[PDB]
Structure formats: C-alpha cells, structure tokens
Amino acid sequence: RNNYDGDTVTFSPTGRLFQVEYALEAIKQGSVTVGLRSNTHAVLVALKRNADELSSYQKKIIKCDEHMGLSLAGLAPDARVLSNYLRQQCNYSSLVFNRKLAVERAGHLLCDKAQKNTQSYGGRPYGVGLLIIGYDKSGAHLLEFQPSGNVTELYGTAIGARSQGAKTYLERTLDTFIKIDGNPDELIKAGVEAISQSLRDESLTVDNLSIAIVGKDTPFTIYDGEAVAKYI
Amino acid sequence: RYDSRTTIFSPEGRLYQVEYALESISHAGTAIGIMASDGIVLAAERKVTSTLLEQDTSTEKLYKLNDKIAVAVAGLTADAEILINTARIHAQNYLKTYNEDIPVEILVRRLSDIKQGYTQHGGLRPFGVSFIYAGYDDRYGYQLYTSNPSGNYTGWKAISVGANTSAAQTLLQMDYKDDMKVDDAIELALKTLSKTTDSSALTYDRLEFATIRKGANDGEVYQKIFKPQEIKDILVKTGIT
Amino acid sequence: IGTGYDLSNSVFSPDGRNFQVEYAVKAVENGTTSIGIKCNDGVVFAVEKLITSKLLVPQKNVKIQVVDRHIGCVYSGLIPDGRHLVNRGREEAASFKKLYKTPIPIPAFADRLGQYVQAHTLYNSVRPFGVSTIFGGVDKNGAHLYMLEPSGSYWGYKGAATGKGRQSAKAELEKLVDHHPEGLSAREAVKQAAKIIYLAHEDNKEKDFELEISWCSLSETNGLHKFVKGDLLQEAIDFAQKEIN
Amino acid sequence: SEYDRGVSTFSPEGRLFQVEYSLEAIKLGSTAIGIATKEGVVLGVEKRATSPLLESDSIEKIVEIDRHIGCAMSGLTADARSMIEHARTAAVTHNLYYDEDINVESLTQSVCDLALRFGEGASGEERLMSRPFGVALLIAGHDADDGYQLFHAEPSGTFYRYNAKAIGSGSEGAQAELLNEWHSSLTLKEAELLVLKILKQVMEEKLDENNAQLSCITKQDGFKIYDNEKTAELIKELKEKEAAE
Amino acid sequence: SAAGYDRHITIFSPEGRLYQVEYAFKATNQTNINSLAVRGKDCTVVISQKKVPDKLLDPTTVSYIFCISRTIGMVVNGPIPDARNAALRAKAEAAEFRYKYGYDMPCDVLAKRMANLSQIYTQRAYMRPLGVILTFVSVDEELGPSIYKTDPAGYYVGYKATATGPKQQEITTNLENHFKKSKIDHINEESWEKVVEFAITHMIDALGTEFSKNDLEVGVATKDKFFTLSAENIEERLVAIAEQ
Amino acid sequence: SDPSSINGGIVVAMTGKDCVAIACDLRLGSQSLGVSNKFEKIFHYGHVFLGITGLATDVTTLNEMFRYKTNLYKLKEERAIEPETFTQLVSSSLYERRFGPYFVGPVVAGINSKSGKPFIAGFDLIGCIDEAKDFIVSGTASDQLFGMCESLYEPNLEPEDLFETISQALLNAADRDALSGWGAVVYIIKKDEVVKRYLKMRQD
Amino acid sequence: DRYSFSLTTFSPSGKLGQIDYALTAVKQGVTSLGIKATNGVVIATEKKSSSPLAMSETLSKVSLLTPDIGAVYSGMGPDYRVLVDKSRKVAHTSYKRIYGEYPPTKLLVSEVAKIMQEATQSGGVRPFGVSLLIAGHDEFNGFSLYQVDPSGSYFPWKATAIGKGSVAAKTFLEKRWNDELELEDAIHIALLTLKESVEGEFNGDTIELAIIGDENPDLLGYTGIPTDKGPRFRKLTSQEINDRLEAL
Amino acid sequence: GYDRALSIFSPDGHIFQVEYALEAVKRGTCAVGVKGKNCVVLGCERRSTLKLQDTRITPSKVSKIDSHVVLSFSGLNADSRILIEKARVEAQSHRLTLEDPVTVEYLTRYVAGVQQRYTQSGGVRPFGVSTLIAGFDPRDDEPKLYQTEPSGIYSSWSAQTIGRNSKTVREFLEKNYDRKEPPATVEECVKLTVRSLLEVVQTGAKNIEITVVKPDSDIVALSSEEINQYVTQIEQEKQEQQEQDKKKKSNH
C-alpha cells in the first residue's frame, strides 16, 4: 500500500512520496546531458532529439543570461515554468544590485519553488533535472538541480538517459580537467567523450551536439554545426 | 454512481440529482392553484399536525411576496425559506427601479435561473421545491405558472404538484368549466384536496388558503389569505363539514 | 491500517498518535547524523555530510546554515525540506529585528519555528514537515540549545542528536553529562563534537564523510556565530582520529 | 485509479496521463498536412462529408493568425477556439509594441504556454483552464531573419520544428511518405500536388475539394487561402500525371 | 461504525455525533500526565506532574503550566503539538481583550472564548479539533477563585475541583470525599501555602506515588496575579507534609 | 446655504389631540426656475406619512428607498409599520451615508395603533431623534414656520380645530418665502380616516 | 449511505441522512420543553452534572438571547454556545436600529433559521447538533413559543418538547394542556412532565425552570420612566423552584 | 473512470459529459432549419399535454435574439434559459460598442464560446443544449443558418434536424432539399418545414410552431390559422401521391 500513489500531501510509509520518486523516472526517460567544470570554465553538452529525419531537433540549451545558462533532461513542460522563473531572478539581481546572481544562490530559490508544489495539492510537481552553469565572482560552478529541490555542487555530473557512463568518464578523468585552465578547447572535448559512452545503441552526429560554454575569458556562446564538428 | 458533484451527467443526459429533487416533492403536502377569470385560488396542505401545534394563528406554506402576487409551497420547508426571501427582494427591486410591480413571467424566470445555477455551477445541491405562482400584471391579466425543481416554468389555467400529482391532475382537468369562477376554484380545490389527503374529513386547521380578487373591489387587486373560520364556511358548502 | 487516521492529518487515531506523523519521524532517521552540544558558554553544531562519490567538491555542501549572525541551525531528514524551514525561519528572524531593534532571543525563535510545522498539520492540503532541526546560540540569557521535531513538539536540551548515526551520538552525549556537569566548555566541545561524529560514522560505514563544524561562543567567537574552518577544524579532526583509535 | 483522476499525480513513468490522452484526440481529428519548401509553405487539410446537407466550405479549418501567418489544425474545435483567439492576440500585440512582424518561433512559444495549463493554479503559472488541450496546430509563417519556418505546436510538450509534418487520423502513413518525397528541389506548384497525392490515400472518401482545402504562405502574397476552382483544377492535373506514368 | 464517519467532522454518524472528536478524549493517556486543580477560599491552586525522564533535558524547559497573562495561569494535559497551538491563541486573545475592553479577562470569559474557538475548528473539515485539555485558573475580581476546564470538544463547565489524566478518576473520588464530608467546596485554610500542602497530600495518596520537586510543577493564582513556583519552593511544601 | 436651501420646499406636521395634520407645499423649484406647481411632498407607507424637504433628487430617490424597507417589514411581520419605529429607521438609514450624506430634512408623522397616541418627529441631514407633541416644521421657511405654528398653537385641539391652525400657518409663511408656496395640500388624519383638503392659495 | 457522505444528493424517500442524524444528536441531549399559556410561558430543562464535582449552577442551560426572549436547547453542548452568540449580535443589528428596542420573537426565529439552513446546503459543512426552543414575548403577536430545527425550518407551537424524553413528554402534554391555563398552572404541568424523564435526582438545584411573563423593572436596572418595560424574561432561583415543586 | 470531471478525456479522445449531452438533446423538443434563397424558416415542436396548459403566457420555443436574428433550441428547457438571456444581452452590447447590426457569424461564435468556456473549466459544466440560429443582416440577402453543440463547436449546415427523433426527418430533408436551388418560394419553405415537423408531432398544428425570418429586419410568428392551412394542403398532396403510386402498380 500504495494508498499513497495518489497523495502528494500524504507521507508514504517509507518517509518519501512516490510522486517524488516517479519524478526521478521522468529524468531517466529524459534526454542526456553531461556537465563538467574547471575554475575558469564550465561546459554543458547535451543530446538533441528528434522523432524523425524531417525534424530540425529540440533545443536542449536555454540561455538564461549572458553568463549563465542551463540544460535539461526530463519534462519539458516543467522545464519551461522553472526557466521563466530563473531568468526573472538573474535579471532582478542585475537591475537592483548591479550584481551577477551566484550559481549557488539561484539554486536555493529554485529549492523553495520545488517543495512549494510538494506542500500544495495544486498544480503538477516537477519532474525534470537541470544541469546549471554560471560564472560568478567565485569562478565557474556546476549545480545539479533535482525536481526534489536538492542542489548539489560537483566537479562533474550528468542526468538523463543512460547517464551512469558519464559519471564513470568523469570519475576517471576528475583531475585531468582541474589542472586545465584557460583552454576552452580541452573542456569541450572532454564532454563529447563523455556522452559517447553514456549513450548505447546510438552514435553522435554533428547536429545532435549542442555545446554551451561560459568561463572567465570565454563569453556565454552556443556552438552548433561547424563549431562542433571540430570536436566530434 | 453520479452523486459526487452536480458538474456531471448521468446517461439520460440529465442528472440523478435532479431525479432526487423531484422525489422530495412527493413526500411533502399537496398543492393546487386553480385560475379563473374572476380570481385565482392558492391552496396548500399541512404535512405536520398536532392539537398543541400552532397552526390556527399562522401559516407556513403561504407567503405574499408583494401585494399583488402570492405563492404556495410543496417540498421540504427547509429548502423553501431562502428562495422566498430572494423572490420577494427581487420584487422590491422591480418596484424601486421601474416604479411598478413585477410581471409574473420574469419573477418566476429569475428564480428558475437561480435553481439551475446551483445545478450548473459547483457541487451544491439542486433545491427540491415546487412553488405555484399566482400573480397579476396588466399585460396578460391573471397568470398561473409553476416552477420546476429543475428550474423551468410553464404557464397554466390549473395545476397540481405535491403528492399524487397524476391522480390530482386527472381530477382537476375533468371538472374544469371553461369560463371558470373564483367561487368554483375555491369549491374544486377542497374536493380535490380531500381525495389525495389521507384523512377522510378535511378540516380548516389542516388547510391553508388564499384567494386573489380584482373582480370585487375593482381597479385594484386585493389578495387575502383566509382566516380559519372562513375556510370553515367554504368547507360547509362542499359538504365535507 | 485504513479507516482514516493517517490518510489525513486532521483525523485522529484511538491510540493518541498519528501514523502519518510517524513516517515523517522515519524520514529524519534516514537522513545524515547532526548533533548539537550545549555548553556553559556556547553551543557547538556538527553535521555529517556523507561523501557518496569523489565527484563532490569538499567543503561546499553541508547542512550548517546561519540565521542572523548568531543563531546556528542545522537540519536532518529530507535535505531540501530542511533548507526550506531555515528559509522561512530567516524571514521570521528579520521581522523581529526591524520591529524591536534588537536581536532575536533564542527561545523566541524557538516559539516561532514550531508554529510553522503546526500550521502544516491543520490542513489536509498541506503535507507536514519531516525534518528535525537542532538549533541555538548565545543571547541575553546566555547560551541555549533546542531541538524541534516534525510533530511540532520541541524542548530544550543539554545535548541533542538526530539522523541515522544518532544511536552512537546519544551515548557519547550521556558520557559527557557525567564527565562534565557543565556539559563541557565551549572550546573543548569543538573537539568533542568531532569524536562523536566519527563513532556515528561507524554506523554509515561503506562510505566516507565530510565533517563540518560551526560554533557560537560568548567570548571565544565573540557573541557571534562563525564557521569552524582552517587550522581549527584540522585540530578537531586529529583529536577524533586519535581517541577513536 | 488515483492516476487518471488528478493533474497533480504522476505515475511510474513520471508523467501525467492527462497529457497522454490528449494526443489521441488529435488522431481522432481529420488529417492535416503541412510541407515546407523555400518558396512558401503549403497547408492542406481534410474535411469530412457524411451528409449532403453539411456545408463544409462555409466554416474554416485553415485560419489566418496574422498577415503572413496561417495555421492548420486537428482535434476538437473547442480546444482550437481558445488556442487561435489567443494566438490572434499575440501577433496583434507584437505589432503594437515594436511596429514589426512577429517572428515565427516566438508565436510558437505563446501557444505552448497556454497548452501548459491542465489544472488549477501553480507557482509561476496561474491556471484557469482545467483540462488538456485536445488540439494541435501546424504553425507556418515567414520571418525575415531566417526564412519560411514550419513548426508543430504540441499541447503536451514543447514545440518541435519540422520541414514537413502530418497530424490527424492519417498522420501515420503520411509521415513515411513525406521522408521519401520531401526534398529541397521542389518548387511551389509541386508542393501543392504533393499534399493532394498523400491526402487521398488515408482519406476514406474520394479526392474532391468539398473535403479539401489548400493554402500557402508566400510573404509576397500575404497569407492566401485558396478558391475552390483552383483546388478542383489541381485534382484533375494530379490524376492526369499519374495516369500517364 | 465506519463508512465516512470517523474520517470527518462534517460527516455525522448514525448517533449524530463525531467519533473523531471523541478520539482526542483518549489523547490524555498518551502523555501519561495528571493534574489536580483545587480552589482555596482566596486562591486557586494548580499542580500538575512534571516529567523529566532523561538527563539531557533541563527541568526548567519542560513545564506544562504556562503564563498566559498577568493574572491567568493554565495547565495543559495531553499532546505537545496541540498544547502550543492552544497556548498561542489564548495569549494573543487575552492580551488583545484586556486593552480593547479594559477589563482583566475572567476565567469564565477566557474559557468561553476558547470553547467557542474549539467549536469553529470542528464545523469545517479544513481545520481540526485541539487534543489537549486546558484547565484555566484565575482568581477573578467578579467571582473570586475559579476553575473552568475546557475540553477538546468545546465544552466548558465549572468545577469545585477537577482533575485530568489517565488515572484522573482515582483523584476525582478523593476530592469527592473531601468536599462532601466538610460541606464546603474549598480547602478550609486561608494561607495559599497551606492549601498547596493539602493538595499535594491528596495527590500522593490518590495516585499511590510520592512525588519530588522535579516531579511537580505548581502554579498558584492569588488575587489579581499568577506566578509559577520553582523547584526549591516546591520542595519546601513537600517536606512540610513529610515531617509534622 | 446647503443644497436643501437651494431647492427648498416646506413640509410641516403637527399634533392636536388624537389626531395629526401633515401638510406640504406644491412648489418644486430647482433654484430660480420653478419646475412644477403640483409635486406633492406627502407620501405614505401604510398609515405612516413621510414628508420630504430638500433637494429634488433626494425627494424621489429616498422615497423609493424607504418604500423598499417598509415593504419587507410589512410582509414578514404581517402588520403596519409604526411611526414610532419609522423614526428609528429614518435616522439610521440617512446616517449610513455620512461621507455622502443625503441633503434633506424629513418629517415623519402617523398615529400608533398600539395605543392611539399621535407621533411626529423631526430630522435633519443625517437625522436625529427630535421628539415633539406640538409640531415639527422643516425647509427654507422653517424659521418663519417655527414661530408661526407656536403662535397659533393652543394645546389640546379637535380634528377640526387642527385644520384651522395648520392652514393659517402655511398660508402666510409659504407666501412670504421666495422658494416656497405655489399651492398647498393638507392631510388631516382624524384617526384612521384621512381627509384631503386642498388649500386655495395663490401661485407663488 | 451516499446521502450523508455527500449533502448534494437526497434519499429517494426524501431528506439527507445528515438531518435524520442531526435529530438523533438532539435526543442524545438533556430534555427541554415549553408550554404556552395566555398570561405566560414557562420554559424548563434539566441539567446533567456529569460528575459529582461538576458545577452546572455556574453555567445554566437557560440563556437570554435578548432580555425579553430566552432559549434552551436539546442536543450537543458546544454547538449551542456559538449559536447563542450569533443570536445576541444579529438581534441588535436587525431591529435595535429599526425599532430601537429589542426585536419581536417572530423576527429572530426567521433569522436563526437562515443560519441552520445554510449548513444543510453544501458539502464540507455539517448541520448544528441542536434543536432549540425560543420563547419570548412581544406586544405585536403576544406570547409565542417556537421550535427551531437544524434542517433550516422552524415551527411555532403551543407546547412541544424535544430531547431524550421527547416521545414520553409529548403525549403527557396533550392530556394536561387546556384552552386557558395560568402561568402558575403551566409551571405545575412543566415539573411533572420533566420528572418522568429523570427521577431520583429531581430537585431545583438540578432542574432549572424559569418563565417569560410580565416585566421586571428590577432586572431592568432602572426606574423613573412612565413607558419602561423591563425584561419579560425572569429567572426563578433554586429556592423558588422548590416552592413550586412542593406544590405538586 | 474519465467521466468524473471535465479534466479527463477517455483514450478515444472523447469526454463522456459531452457524449451524454448529445443524448440530452434527444430528450427535449425537435427543431428543423431549412433555408430558402430570400428566407430562412426556423420551425420548432411546441409541447402541449393538457388543455390547462396555455400557449399565451407559456414560454415560447422561438426566442427573438434581435430584430433580424432568431434562435430556437433543443435540449433541456431549464438549461436553455440561462443561454437565452445571455445571448440577448450580448446582442445589445455589440450594438452599444460598435454601433453596428448583429452579425450572424459573430453571434454563433460568441454563443458557442459561452459553452466552450465551461467545458474548458472543470469546476462548472456546460449546458446540454444545441441550438439553431438562423438570420439575415441588412447587408446580406444571402441566408445563413448555424448550429451550436454542447462541446463548443460551431458548424454551418444548409438544412438541419436536431432534438426529439431527428433521425427519420433528417433523411426526408436531404432528398427534398436541393443545394442547386434551395426553396425560392417562401411558402414552400414553410410548407417543407411543416412536412418535417409533421413526422415528429404525430397529429398537430397547435403543436407546430413556425416562425419566418426575411431580410432587412422582418420577423414574424405565424398564427395558429396559417399553420393549420398548410396541413390541409399537405395531407391532400401526400395522400394524392400515394393513390397514384398504387395506380402505377395497377397499370402493369
């Protein structure tokens, strides 16, 4: 029992909710992205999906700001409500305080917003993971936002389908990319290797790659076509 | 089952809720309004009675909503109180606004929209009440209507609701004389009331009555809820007492 | 079970408990060990933040968060859910400062937080909290240590403990009443906090941990709360490892 | 069970089944095809006839959303009414604010933003529209900064750009045929006879214009909905071409 | 029965009553605490047990006697969550009443407005009843010494003396003998200290268990004031009994 | 001064002995322009007579206003509204607006049926209890009438005696006022009989 | 079943299950009764102490809504108190500015009724646990008595009773009631009827009986006005009830 | 199920509230719309049972929306009341804002909009009423006939039956109706409408309500004498045709 498979306002005997648990499922059916970072750069590499070969592929990179940006893996409807919210906060910090919003500080606002819908009986709870990059005063940071609202600062992480091989690339090469600083080229190449292994019964193509980069010297820029056929 | 909210429909394309309100009428008292060219009578039957019940200095199923229009009640009495008060408020708005008394067709029409509104909107009951409207307006003269618990109205020259509607109706339409008289309305009503009621001797303390007349003390309408001893006079003519 | 009684938070059992509030307490148990130790001149808070992979960045994820500059709070259970009780807590703190032009007394804070948990059981459309919160500081009356339950029950403590390795902690806290009937002084309690969390980490053993300690002490942190970091924390680490061995 | 009753309950897929069911509403609807070329986008539709009294040429199924924007649709007209009235306001409001054409991509975002409402309230989105939308649109226009763009506004997720996309009952067989027959070498006229060629195959009725309606987006022409005579002519050229080969 | 009934407080049973409210009258057995309130002639006394069962709890943070306002004490029996909720509303309303109406809020009037409050929580299904029993003690300026007990239902009635807890009965029977034989509804002595001696003695016989200074907490309401006694003051009264 | 002074018009009610008279002028003017030579200022809800002085709008609007409330009172309780109880009502109803107060000076008169005693009461803009068993006068010629009525009043009078007193009163006082006159009408409530006697007087 | 898990739908034999349960809730109460005479009205009730130590003298179960109108109940104790509160407030508003003195009995009953009715109307609300009796005196309809049902309907009566012993009290009242009774005579009926219900405790300490008759300028708190009408309501003390209780 | 609220569709794409609304239509009185070239005749079944029941004060089954557009209806009569007043207030309000005559295409679209809005919401249910709305505008001499549905769908049909036993009338209507030349005679349009409604009433011409709309704001309600005149002529032709058919048989 599983009288709790309907209630999001009523604890399940384990101390969880099933709704929060199913939300992790949504991420698994969701599209793969690999994060990683260094002190002076942070990179998101994401897989575009298609339903056919007359599709011109789904944007998996949304520009939140000109120095911050996010990627998604899971429910695209839920991803939209939180993207709206997230841009509203970064612009607020540039309006009133002439300030960049820290990666970590943004994440704590998103936390209250997940758990509000858990507390309530109204509207959908979330079911998308966001990999967040930014570059603030405290250099590049990489957060993994969960639909629970738990925000976790790592040197590399991955969410989406078949994401357990990205964690294995990253663990081995953890230190290689701490030592590289000031070379955007190197950090971009490392995500690409990462997501080949993640995937199974697929191969990468040119227009499946969307690489989004910000650092201390690199402005927030998205590379497509000929700007990502140099690292395939 | 369909019972949870009134925002649903049964497979007849009506709602089961409407059927339940219908049935509420047929466990209350019997009510009859017979229209004639010379006055309209309203009649209701009491559904409780005792000898330590005060019912000789009062009525409960008869309200005047303005001095030209009156209503009878059949249904639960608990349901009744709220909607009477609103019809009467709507009448005095009409009086305030237009400087004249409301038409019968609108007053009923409003009330019918309001019943339907509680079906239409929310999980709030339908109100299982049938009211007999007997009115006057100088546009269609005397007007007799009744209002459904579903919330629609239909014009009439005689009608019965309450308990044993079918039994009552056949009996009313049989003895309907085509010019009609207010005196014959009054006479017919007692006769019809008797046979439905489960008492064999109908009595005035068991009766509520109002007759509406403009055919005596012309140029003006005077509506009179009868006093108990007068009701006794009309019973003696029909030979019941 | 059935017949209500846990199916909503309004409904009550014939026993005198609520089995939906019992599963919330189970969620505090599952969360990572936190302790707080009251002293005759301060409070020390410690937390076990376990390391699951070395992909985490060390000293960057914690359950220690500050309120004003002199009330420390630390939470166990559901991680984002403990964050939120601190986020509202912070709002409540500010109101009091603006209106009365004074820092909040710790028992005053203690009343105000537990009213938030209680509001979330009066409504069947609000899921309770499922977090315990160890808290305290130094104020007008000196140092005070409290802990709050996800029931919405709270009381003052000399030593408090919550989480998964709380079975060890409780035992070390007791050894302390006997050892010191002052509950230990605030300086030596930073080292006492580290040793406690190490015996507690024997109940989580299959994994590594990261230990964060913070403090607030009357005249050895100057009435203010600040994070124990630096050469301070490493001394605390060395004491723990030595005496466990 | 407690999964198809509720908009706030996810199932073991981590999805709503409210969202799922609304796809099958579009498949109920009549066949509609859009095919992009670099000459203009061609929007074709199916209508049905079951009565000789049904006037199907006196009500619409291809609609003008601006003065270079057109849309085709499939699904319920109830869900479509809300969607197109909305989409009319977005383009109109754009001309107010900037005094410029609306871009194709941004019109798509607005339609999918309405789509999102399935329930009653949410934080960061007020919801007043209490069901799934059982309608999709193919959204075609022209911006100058790209070219001609053709999009599918999904009521159940975010929007997917296509170069040619079929929706409705006969969507399935149309999609295979467009892969093997959409090419970047194909002129405006060829685009028309392609749609009618696919259209008939999954129609359970003869190819005629009382069950059909083509349109094009040519910026030079503005958005033009066609006459009946032009379509009738083209059914004849289609059959003569295929008679000979 | 059970078909809706117990799951709500807006669904009546076949008896016309609410099972769910009645289950909170069984929530005073879970905290295992007993009170005794008695009135003297010029005072009112309240003694409730204090439970310290662990050496990681200070005796001074665990109390169940609360100052609500200057002349008004209250004892709480039953669960710690519903204890707090009741306490807040009683402090907010007592303070608000006192200056709006310029009167010190009598025992009857505080017990009255709260009982009203408890009835309102029961009529809507959004809210729930309180679980705790609040026994208000004040010496009124309009009635002298009074005890009004408000029940988790929203019943409130006066009492000569009253008791609450799981072993409530055993104390009740002891107070019955006492007031009945003497033919007065007060403890005859006039000094509040000597009344507190009598009340402590009745409880130790009745429960069968001798109490300590850190197994009581005592509030004593006198003419226009209330104060709660500390453990060493309580000890003085205990040993008063022990050695004649 | 006020708007009540611009439009004017007089309603005077008086007591004799088991009788009342309440009488009015037929002038409605809107400032300098005379508007109607025939607008009666006497209205009634059962046996209670309500006069209204003041601005022309509030004469018509308040009449609708007090009609509404006496009709719900009449139906529910099944008796006539009483002048004793209507005095309570007029004062609260006008007081409802205080920040948009109605600019009138009513006069209530009737005879109670639960004792037969005669009742007259006076009001101002937002109305107050003003109790009399002599007379209440109102309007722009009220200062003339206050003295004129006192001067002719002899305490304790017949229904026929009271006619004479209120007629001579109105006749000269209305005439020697700018904004008043232009016909008059006198209602003598004998007990429950009301005779209506039109005053032949000049057109002012 | 579903006709009192919901309030929307009705039994096919009429009425909600909630109303029939609300009447069950009435009978689980003390017994209250009223008898009207032509120079008075007696209202009488019992009070269960429900502890040897409980003081029911400190709260009486006969409570003035306004000075000329008292009321009793039979049914749930908590439900009575808030309902009485609202009676005192609405009364001033509704008629102490319309008539500047306290209402007609008749009027306050039509008001009370609307409140009971509104809790029978929608789901997520329950009926009140009581049926009240409201007795009072006004000069416009004279002496009156009423029973006010939590269904949202009200009935005037000459004598009626409600509570646990209602069914025994009703046949009793039929027999002893006459066309002219005195106030004293109606008090002498009222004691006997209620004594059928409880016996082995009957005394005026445990039974509360009081009257609505004529004015008391003594409970008015002022004198010196030729028109003053003091409280039609009057409480007999414990001692006065005993004088009547001997008279049987 | 998926019939618990309007926030759930069935996996076919249907919402059972709407499907039971379509069965609702069939409960109440029948309606026929039949266009000409200078007319539209909009006729409806009038329900009478008892002699008592009037046809003076009793609610008409044709309501005048404006002075050039009319609406007759089919479904629940109680439901249709709210729908009738709403459509008239909107009718006047078009003319308040714009100052223009009430466009038919706008009128159906807004009216079916009221129904749609409830369907979109879950907390309120729409009406189970489908209407026929026929009219002309002063700017058109080309007739328009519209339909609404309890879903929030608006459609255009040349000719239509809805309501009580629509089905058999529906096939009769098809054959006679020509889209070549819809009845140019005004009298023949009324006569067709009488033949169609004849099928569902059984016997009646005090239970047949015919009303006629022609351009430039001319509306009429046709007296009982004129409805009875059609029946005598229409029975004479039906019978005559029948006798003849049996003669073709005799000849061979």
From Swiss-Prot, chain A:
Q: Provide one Gene Ontology cellular component.
A: nucleus
Report if keyword Nucleus is assigned: yes
Q: Which InterPro entries match?
A: Ntn_hydrolases_N, Proteasome_alpha, Proteasome_alpha-type, Proteasome_asu_N, Proteasome_sua/b
Tell me the compartments it is located in: Cytoplasm; Nucleus
- State the signal peptide span: none
Residue list for modification Phosphoserine:
12
Q: Which UniProt keywords apply?
A: Cytoplasm, Isopeptide bond, Nucleus, Phosphoprotein, Proteasome, Ubl conjugation
Record cross-link Glycyl lysine isopeptide (Lys-Gly) (interchain with G-Cter in ubiquitin), residues: 189
**Misc:** Present with 7210 molecules/cell in log phase SD medium.
Record family assignment: Belongs to the peptidase T1A family.
Q: What does this protein do?
A: The proteasome degrades poly-ubiquitinated proteins in the cytoplasm and in the nucleus. It is essential for the regulated turnover of proteins and for the removal of misfolded proteins. The proteasome is a multicatalytic proteinase complex that is characterized by its ability to cleave peptides with Arg, Phe, Tyr, Leu, and Glu adjacent to the leaving group at neutral or slightly basic pH. It has an ATP-dependent proteolytic activity.
- State what protein this is by name: Proteasome subunit alpha type-6
State the organism named in the record.
Answer: Saccharomyces cerevisiae (strain ATCC 204508 / S288c)
UniProtKB/Swiss-Prot annotation, chain B:
The principal location of this protein is: cytoplasm
Q: Kindly give the SUPFAM superfamilies that the UniProt entry links to this protein.
A: N-terminal nucleophile aminohydrolases (Ntn hydrolases) (SSF56235)
Q: Which GO terms describe its biological process?
A: proteasomal ubiquitin-independent protein catabolic process; proteasome core complex assembly; proteasome-mediated ubiquitin-dependent protein catabolic process
Keywords, A to Z, come to: Cytoplasm, Isopeptide bond, Nucleus, Proteasome, Ubl conjugation
**Which GO terms of the cellular component aspect does the record hold?**
cytosol; nucleus; proteasome complex; proteasome core complex, alpha-subunit complex; proteasome storage granule
Positions bearing the Glycyl lysine isopeptide (Lys-Gly) (interchain with G-Cter in ubiquitin) cross-link: 96, 195, 227
Q: Name one Pfam family in it.
A: Proteasome
Q: Which SMART domains match?
A: Proteasome_A_N
Compartments, as annotated in UniProt:
Cytoplasm; Nucleus
This protein's assembly is summarised as: The 26S proteasome consists of a 20S proteasome core and two 19S regulatory subunits. The 20S proteasome core is composed of 28 subunits that are arranged in four stacked rings, resulting in a barrel-shaped structure. The two end rings are each formed by seven alpha subunits, and the two central rings are each formed by seven beta subunits. The catalytic chamber with the active sites is on the inside of the barrel.
Q: Which family does it belong to?
A: Belongs to the peptidase T1A family.
- Note in the entry: Present with 17100 molecules/cell in log phase SD medium.
Protein's UniProt name: Proteasome subunit alpha type-3
Species the sequence originates in: Saccharomyces cerevisiae (strain ATCC 204508 / S288c) (Baker's yeast)
This protein's encoding gene = PRE9
From Swiss-Prot, chain C:
How does it get modified post-translation?
The alpha and beta forms are probably products of the same gene with different post-translational modifications.
The superkingdom of the source organism is Eukaryota
Per its UniProt record, what Pfam families does this chain match?
Proteasome (PF00227), Proteasome_A_N (PF10584)
The UniProt record lists the keyword DNA-binding: no
Q: Which UniProt keywords apply?
A: Acetylation, Cytoplasm, Nucleus, Proteasome
Alphabetical list of PROSITE patterns matching this protein: PROTEASOME_ALPHA_1 (PS00388), PROTEASOME_ALPHA_2 (PS51475)
Under the cellular component aspect of Gene Ontology, which terms does the record hold? nucleus; proteasome complex; proteasome core complex, alpha-subunit complex; proteasome storage granule
* Any one Gene Ontology molecular-function term assigned to this protein's record: mRNA binding
- For whether the record's keyword set contains Mitochondrion, the answer is no
Query: Might you name a Gene Ontology BP term for this protein?
Result: proteasome-mediated ubiquitin-dependent protein catabolic process
User: Where in or outside the cell?
Assistant: Cytoplasm; Nucleus
Q: State the SUPFAM superfamilies in the record.
A: N-terminal nucleophile aminohydrolases (Ntn hydrolases) (SSF56235)
What does the protein in this record do? The proteasome degrades poly-ubiquitinated proteins in the cytoplasm and in the nucleus. It is essential for the regulated turnover of proteins and for the removal of misfolded proteins. The proteasome is a multicatalytic proteinase complex that is characterized by its ability to cleave peptides with Arg, Phe, Tyr, Leu, and Glu adjacent to the leaving group at neutral or slightly basic pH. It has an ATP-dependent proteolytic activity.
Similarity-based family: Belongs to the peptidase T1A family.
Any additional notes?
Present with 12000 molecules/cell in log phase SD medium.
Record-linked PANTHER family:
PROTEASOME SUBUNIT ALPHA/BETA
Protein known as: Probable proteasome subunit alpha type-7
Q: Which organism is it from?
A: Saccharomyces cerevisiae (strain ATCC 204508 / S288c)
UniProtKB/Swiss-Prot annotation, chain G:
Q: Which CDD domains match?
A: proteasome_alpha_type_2
Extract the InterPro entries matched here.
Answer: Ntn_hydrolases_N (IPR029055), Proteasome_alpha (IPR050115), Proteasome_alpha-type (IPR023332), Proteasome_asu_N (IPR000426), Proteasome_sua/b (IPR001353)
Position of the Glycyl lysine isopeptide (Lys-Gly) (interchain with G-Cter in ubiquitin) cross-link: 106
Q: Output the Gene Ontology cellular-component terms.
A: nucleus; proteasome complex; proteasome core complex, alpha-subunit complex; proteasome storage granule
Task: Give the record's GO biological process terms.
Answer: proteasomal ubiquitin-independent protein catabolic process; proteasome-mediated ubiquitin-dependent protein catabolic process
- Give the record's keywords alphabetically: Cytoplasm, Isopeptide bond, Nucleus, Proteasome, Ubl conjugation
**Where in or outside the cell?**
Cytoplasm; Nucleus
Looking up PROSITE patterns in the UniProt record yields:
PROTEASOME_ALPHA_1 (PS00388), PROTEASOME_ALPHA_2 (PS51475)
Could you tell me what this protein does? Answer: The proteasome degrades poly-ubiquitinated proteins in the cytoplasm and in the nucleus. It is essential for the regulated turnover of proteins and for the removal of misfolded proteins. The proteasome is a multicatalytic proteinase complex that is characterized by its ability to cleave peptides with Arg, Phe, Tyr, Leu, and Glu adjacent to the leaving group at neutral or slightly basic pH. It has an ATP-dependent proteolytic activity.
What family is it from? Belongs to the peptidase T1A family.
In its miscellaneous comment, the UniProt entry states: Present with 7060 molecules/cell in log phase SD medium.
Q: What is this protein called?
A: Proteasome subunit alpha type-2
Species whose genome carries this gene: Saccharomyces cerevisiae (strain ATCC 204508 / S288c) (Baker's yeast)
Gene transcribed to yield this protein:
PRE8
